[PDB]
Amino acid sequence: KQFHTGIEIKVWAIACFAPQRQCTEVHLKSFTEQLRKISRDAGMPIQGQPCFCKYAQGADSVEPMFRHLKNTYAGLQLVVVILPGKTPVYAEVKRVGDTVLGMATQCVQMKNVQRTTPQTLSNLCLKINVKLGG
Ligand SMILES: O=c1ccn([C@@H]2O[C@H](COP(=O)(O)O)[C@@H](O)[C@H]2O)c(=O)[nH]1
Structure with a gap:
């Protein structure tokens, strides 16, 4: 679809269901920085500092x-x-x-957080832009 302008993501959270020992704090902080820069450049800036960033394990941890x-x-x-x-x-x-809380979510594979590429970061920005777009 077409790129939507006017989007600024100021309040956002990270929920990491990947094991910390596989996706470490530095992996998270690096990924977030790369995402801040490309999203900014595209004109849909995601602020560098998420309001919340925690590890969780298992589907039962999602709802709480x-x-x-x-x-x-x-x-x-x-x-x-x-x-x-x-x-x-x-x-x-x-x-x-x-279906339950009306909360926008964007999933991403652990491997693309451990090691980013401009293409996969772009894929993610585009998915986010569609979600928060209309
Ligand atoms: O069991 C799953 C289901 C999907 N994804 C990822 O979720 C993404 C899309 O999430 P979303 O756009 O529906 O939020 C993908 O890039 C996809 O690979 C996984 O890592 N594991």
Whole structure:
């Protein structure tokens, strides 16, 4: 679809369902910095500092975390969810976000957080732009 302008993501969270030992704090901080820069350059800036960044394990952790997020951060615009490959966590994120709490979520594969490329970062910005676009 067409690129939407006017989007600024100031309040957003990271929920990392990938094991910390596989996707470390520095991996998260590097990915976020690369994402800040390209999103800024595209004219859909995502602020460098997420309001919340925590590790979680298993689909059952999704609902309590997301309720917590909605209850705590006014103006929350997006939860970026890091997934370790194929996982029932994805269906739960979408059940809770899309059907229960009305929370926009964008999933991303752990491997693309461990090592970024301009193309995969671009893929992500484009997915986010569609979601927060209309
Ligand atoms: O079990 C799953 C399901 C999907 N994804 C990822 O979720 C993304 C899209 O999420 P979303 O745009 O629906 O938020 C993808 O890039 C896809 O690979 C995973 O890592 N594991």
